[PDB]
Design a protein around this motif. Structure first.
Motif, short mmCIF file in Angstrom:
data_model
loop_
_atom_site.label_atom_id
_atom_site.label_comp_id
_atom_site.label_asym_id
_atom_site.label_seq_id
_atom_site.Cartn_x
_atom_site.Cartn_y
_atom_site.Cartn_z
N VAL A 6 -36.08 16.95 7.35
CA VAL A 6 -35.20 15.89 6.87
C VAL A 6 -34.29 16.42 5.77
CG1 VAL A 6 -36.44 13.81 7.55
CG2 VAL A 6 -37.20 15.12 5.56
N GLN A 7 -34.91 16.98 4.73
CA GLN A 7 -34.12 17.51 3.62
C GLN A 7 -33.24 18.66 4.08
OE1 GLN A 7 -35.20 20.21 -0.37
NE2 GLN A 7 -36.49 18.48 0.24
N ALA A 8 -33.77 19.53 4.95
CA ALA A 8 -32.97 20.63 5.48
C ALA A 8 -31.77 20.12 6.26
CB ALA A 8 -33.84 21.53 6.35
N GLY A 9 -31.98 19.12 7.12
CA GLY A 9 -30.87 18.58 7.89
C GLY A 9 -29.83 17.90 7.02
N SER A 10 -30.29 17.15 6.01
CA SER A 10 -29.36 16.51 5.09
C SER A 10 -28.53 17.55 4.34
CB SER A 10 -30.12 15.61 4.12
OG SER A 10 -31.04 16.37 3.36
N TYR A 11 -29.18 18.63 3.88
CA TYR A 11 -28.44 19.69 3.22
C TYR A 11 -27.43 20.33 4.16
CZ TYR A 11 -27.46 23.77 0.33
OH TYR A 11 -26.84 24.74 -0.42
N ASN A 12 -27.83 20.57 5.41
CA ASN A 12 -26.92 21.18 6.37
C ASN A 12 -25.68 20.32 6.57
OD1 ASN A 12 -27.93 23.77 7.43
ND2 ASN A 12 -29.73 22.56 8.00
N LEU A 13 -25.88 19.02 6.80
CA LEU A 13 -24.75 18.13 7.00
C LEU A 13 -23.86 18.08 5.76
CD1 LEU A 13 -26.74 15.33 8.79
CD2 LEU A 13 -24.87 16.62 9.82
N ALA A 14 -24.48 17.96 4.58
CA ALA A 14 -23.70 17.90 3.35
C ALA A 14 -22.84 19.14 3.19
CB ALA A 14 -24.63 17.72 2.15
N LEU A 15 -23.44 20.32 3.37
CA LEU A 15 -22.70 21.56 3.19
C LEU A 15 -21.59 21.69 4.22
CD1 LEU A 15 -22.43 24.56 2.08
CD2 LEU A 15 -23.98 25.13 3.94
N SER A 16 -21.88 21.36 5.48
CA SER A 16 -20.87 21.50 6.52
C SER A 16 -19.67 20.61 6.22
CB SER A 16 -21.46 21.16 7.88
OG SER A 16 -22.14 19.92 7.84
N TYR A 17 -19.92 19.36 5.84
CA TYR A 17 -18.81 18.44 5.61
C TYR A 17 -18.06 18.79 4.33
CZ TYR A 17 -19.85 15.48 9.54
OH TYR A 17 -20.02 14.99 10.82
N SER A 18 -18.77 19.23 3.29
CA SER A 18 -18.10 19.64 2.07
C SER A 18 -17.18 20.83 2.32
CB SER A 18 -19.12 19.98 0.99
OG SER A 18 -19.83 18.82 0.59
N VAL A 19 -17.65 21.81 3.10
CA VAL A 19 -16.80 22.95 3.41
C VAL A 19 -15.63 22.53 4.29
CG1 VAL A 19 -16.74 25.25 4.40
CG2 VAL A 19 -18.75 24.50 3.16
N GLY A 20 -15.88 21.64 5.25
CA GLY A 20 -14.79 21.17 6.10
C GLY A 20 -13.72 20.45 5.31
N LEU A 21 -14.11 19.76 4.24
CA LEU A 21 -13.13 19.10 3.40
C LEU A 21 -12.17 20.09 2.74
CD1 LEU A 21 -12.19 16.37 2.32
CD2 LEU A 21 -13.76 16.67 0.41
N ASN A 22 -12.53 21.37 2.71
CA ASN A 22 -11.64 22.37 2.13
C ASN A 22 -10.36 22.51 2.94
OD1 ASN A 22 -12.33 23.40 -0.33
ND2 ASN A 22 -13.41 25.20 0.45
N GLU A 23 -10.44 22.26 4.25
CA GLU A 23 -9.27 22.40 5.10
C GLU A 23 -8.29 21.25 4.93
OE1 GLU A 23 -8.48 25.15 7.30
OE2 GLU A 23 -9.91 25.82 5.78
N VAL A 24 -8.79 20.07 4.58
CA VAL A 24 -7.94 18.88 4.53
C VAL A 24 -7.01 18.97 3.33
CG1 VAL A 24 -7.93 16.39 4.27
CG2 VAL A 24 -9.63 17.48 5.74
N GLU A 25 -5.73 18.72 3.56
CA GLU A 25 -4.75 18.74 2.49
C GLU A 25 -4.74 17.41 1.75
OE1 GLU A 25 -2.86 21.17 1.27
OE2 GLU A 25 -3.86 22.58 2.62
N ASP A 26 -4.30 17.46 0.49
CA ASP A 26 -4.24 16.28 -0.36
C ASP A 26 -2.95 15.51 -0.09
OD1 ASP A 26 -6.67 16.51 -1.60
OD2 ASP A 26 -5.90 17.62 -3.33
#
Ligand SMILES: Nc1ncnc2c1ncn2[C@@H]1O[C@H](COP(=O)(O)OP(=O)(O)OP(=O)(O)O)[C@@H](O)[C@H]1O
Ligand SMILES: Nc1ncnc2c1ncn2[C@@H]1O[C@H](COP(=O)(O)OP(=O)(O)OP(=O)(O)O)[C@@H](O)[C@H]1O
Ligand SMILES: NS(=O)(=O)c1cc2c(cc1Cl)NCNS2(=O)=O
Lengths: 373, 898
Positions: free
Chosen positions: A1-21
């Motif tokens: 559970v904790q591992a999956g939550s961390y994986n999702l959090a990290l993936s989406y946080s990194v993906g947000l790097n691509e989105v422009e402001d």
């Protein structure tokens, strides 16, 4: 559970790097200076009311004093604070730093806290209710915190309550629906729109969705109709859904004699009583106490101080029973506005109320737009 | 006194000009002072009636109104017909509510439906929908002109004046009509509006003619055809359905009707020609839908209440006593249709005659003119919509070649090129003259557009970005979702293969747009949704209680400007990607402390560079007086909740010999601070250095071949020394590398001979292919290398043999890096161990892809920083492969494993 939550959090946080402001997607990311979050629950409640699943909220705690960090105690207390926040159902991140004083810790938090694009852009700090009966060094450090926030391009939000912010969890005013009371907004100066965005998002929750929002703007006695129409048109273009617009044509009127005397007495113990010498020959006395005021500075800032004391009367005679008062926070130039004078202005703007008073100020960058690019 | 507020201050009051990006009517656009200024020291336009309501109303009305609706009401009855109309209207009205909501958020420009969809949902779906919409309109113009041409051909043939033949006459008539329409449209929008109004007037006259005809008493001709004027008996009988033929099914009638009346976007496609689109689009569209629905219901009821289903059509079938046996209500008014009903062979009546609405009306030519007007108005609206939408799409530059079209023209930027392209496509499709097998495809394209509109509204509502503030608040996101889903369902229910074709085209265009990576940033629900997802999952992680069962290596890489030292970022990203947080820390010395817009621009450039190397890391920059203070700030505050770094990755400073000793003091201080913060330290050393001052290449970007990774495990730090090489060896570039562990497992920890090392390696599931023992560590190293070490350390000697410990710090007050004679004599055996280990590494690992060694630790105060740096230098020197000196956090990383 904790591992999956961390994986999702990290993936989406990194993906947000691509989105422009973009201005359309601007979000107020708040760094709330709460210290121990159970000491000032009002700040936490107020910020979480309008930040909940809409923007990042960080509770910043500065541990004053010297210490070789690490230790298991720091982690234990951080875990306890996080558990307390979770028990209150507040979506916020607790973050503590160790610094010699509050200013240094706040600078550390403003410089490093966050993750990529998910980093705060607004500083929320409580009002220094005891600024008069306290060492002036603390007042200087508080005003310096505000100055650093501005220097980092942050928006500043100062919260004042009648009884102060420092106190089964405690219950605050912001946990109960306000009802039909009004949210009074005094948009005196153009800061980009933060003064309006915060109350708009506040009213989008079910606790404030019933409040009538009133917008007060300065104007001229002979052009009140035109000014009201123009401001209403602007607000409709923003599509903020604000109900009433009032124009204040007497903000430049000289304030009552008693109130100006009160303001003068407020800064009496900060008067350096040396305003008859050159500024070059007046910084020698300020080397040890860079918070005293020189008579030249007072003479130059007399008009602004009078405007502050008069705005206080205007607010007192209009927003005596509002559920929230929002006022644009005045800006004092570095080196030409002693910390004492800035503190006096902040004290004078919000006083003698039953205040959930918020002094807001954006970074002079637009946060609202009537365009779809 | 009583002057304008703000006349005596630098600060400005709120005004419209501060927010507009247009051209200021008065002087230039005023700009509010920047925060540093206050801070710091020292063209015809149309209304909503003629621009939206008329256009949408004409678009919705088609030829099914005159030639199919009476037949549908005869076959399915009045109640079922009303049900069909109401179902279609619910779909269309949900779509209209969605479009109204999407159309009141900021100011809409030319581009019609495509503009709204693209600006509210993103270029990816927007571009595909725009292309499909333009093509569908360019073919709908052809379809409507073909309907008009077929009506004209039928009229001419009835009059007995054919030109060539039924099929060719359609071609000639359609080509001429489409050319006339093109000429009308090129004349400008004023003439287009005039033609639209004329067609609307013609349709209104046709409605009035039909209504008047349906009230006058029935003549012999009309009576012998089923028309009898409103009768309670006829109305009651015509309520239940009476199915007939191969299409006498509810679904058949729905399929005939629904695709005929759905063109509600005609008014919103000329948004660039409206006065206040945010006020006109919603009102006009909704009013048009309401009025068209009312017209459909009224026509259905009135026609079903006046005409019987069966009628012979011959004037001799009057009922008289003596001959014939009357059957049905029609024999109560004096007409005998018994024979036709029995043989089921009468060609007149509501169910058998297709032009019953024209027969009932008081003047058939008025009904024919109404049909002409409806068809021509639909064709013109489709032409204009296609041209405008395509011009906007080509302006946006999301496709490689269509950019040619979009060149505006005098005054109004009229897309003449787009008009010509649409007319060419329409003529090409008219030349076919047969579209019964293409019409479903166009209808399904329109349904796809409706579904995309509804989903755009729903997505914007659900994301709830602070910028999503529509002034039209009479919509529901759940209603929009239902509308989109039902649109897709109907698309599949009508012409399922056409639905598949349309969906495949949409998917292909979306994939092309996504791959092309357009350079447009409008601000869409997709970007807001990405932020929403990131925030939601970070908060969810924060909610989960702290536990050790999820250790990850979260690295804070000190790279400065990431492009300056790409080897460090490449190496860390190799074993961090898709596994744990990676932060690229950059410290700016900086005069004073400030963050101006230039700093933000430089940070954005660094992030773009990082994202162009396909590296998943966050770039963070801080301002500090020296590097050590910046690293302290980063280690203190960097991160978010639980996703904060716990390993410090720093490069080796190979210039420490020739540099101010204070610099090496600060470097060792950074190491000690990382240790004190409960961080794992990882020093990377390469013979060429890390500083290399499109993308620069790096040895970590290439295959490693059969080279071996050598680990020199000299201290039990908790597993990081082994975790890093193990993670590195799971990548496709290090897979072929054989991992060798030189297990001096526990020097001062009572290491086991062979049992403990093998057990720990197995528990690490590292696949350690070899394990070697090197107990020759305490052996005195060769005198030459000891002399080398003495030479390197000589400059930092303080020469304090006779001086006591109490007085040594005195001369150290300003030079704390200098070593003490007592210190030299204390750290002698442990200093020679460094040289001996270097000997061993040099003799064993000289052809290895990577070398990993345990990082020596220097005790504060009793280990001078210069001596620690000398140990680091000797340990890793003369080695070709990259050397990583690691020391774990003393925390069990074995929990990372499954
Ligand atoms: N240790 C801290 N960490 C983060 N913010 C702090 C900390 N201490 C104070 N603050 C912020 O500074 C503001 C002013 O605090 P200060 O103590 O100067 O005034 P006060 O709250 O009236 O005094 P007291 O804390 O004794 O009640 C508070 O509203 C709080 O938000
Ligand atoms: N401004 C900075 N921000 C973050 N890290 C830095 C910065 N400057 C140096 N470092 C780190 O300190 C290490 C040593 O840098 P220093 O300039 O002291 O020696 P160097 O030999 O120039 O290093 P390099 O060969 O990487 O340039 C580098 O590997 C780098 O990771
Ligand atoms: N001209 S239009 O883009 O508004 C349009 C036309 C038709 C539609 C739908 C739309 Cl949006 N569907 C039915 N066939 S149509 O009249 O050509």
């Amino acid at each position: 559970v904790q591992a999956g939550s961390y994986n999702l959090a990290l993936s989406y946080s990194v993906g947000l790097n691509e989105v422009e402001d973009h201005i359309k997607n601007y979000r107020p990311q708040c760094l709330v200076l709460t210290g121990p979050p159970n000491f000032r629950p009002a700040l936490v409640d107020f910020v979480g009311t309008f930040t909940r699943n809409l923007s990042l909220m960080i509770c910043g705690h500065v541990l004053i004093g010297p210490h070789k960090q690490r230790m298991p105690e720091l982690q234990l207390i951080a875990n306890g604070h996080t558990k307390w926040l979770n028990k209150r159902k507040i979506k916020a991140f607790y973050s503590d730093v160790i610094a010699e004083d509050l200013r240094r810790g706040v600078q550390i938090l403003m410089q490093a806290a966050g993750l990529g694009r998910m980093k705060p852009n607004i500083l929320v700090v409580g009002f220094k209710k005891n600024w008069q009966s306290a060492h002036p060094a603390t007042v200087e450090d508080y005003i310096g915190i505000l100055h650093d926030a501005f220097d980092f391009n942050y928006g500043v939000c100062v919260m004042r309550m009648r009884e102060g912010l420092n106190v089964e969890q405690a219950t605050t005013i912001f946990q109960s629906e306000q009802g039909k009371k009004t949210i009074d907004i005094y948009w005196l100066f153009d800061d980009g729109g933060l003064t309006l965005l915060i109350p708009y998002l506040l009213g989008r929750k079910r606790r404030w969705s019933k409040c009538k929002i009133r917008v007060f703007v300065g104007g001229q006695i002979n052009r009140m109709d035109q000014e009201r129409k123009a401001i209403i048109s602007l607000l409709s273009k923003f599509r903020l859904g604000f109900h009433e617009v009032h124009i204040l044509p007497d903000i430049n009127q000289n304030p009552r004699a008693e109130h100006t005397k009160r303001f003068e007495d407020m800064i009496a113990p900060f008067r350096l009583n040396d305003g008859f010498k050159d500024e070059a020959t007046v910084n020698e006395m300020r080397r040890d106490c860079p918070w005293k005021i020189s008579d030249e500075e007072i003479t130059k800032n007399r008009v602004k101080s009078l405007r502050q004391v008069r705005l206080n009367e205007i607010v007192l005679d209009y927003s005596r029973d509002a559920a929230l008062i929002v006022i644009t926070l005045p800006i004092g130039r570095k080196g030409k506005c002693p910390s004492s004078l800035y503190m006096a202005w902040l004290e004078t703007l919000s006083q003698d109320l039953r205040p959930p008073v918020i002094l807001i100020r954006g970074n002079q960058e637009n946060v609202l737009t009537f365009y779809c690019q």
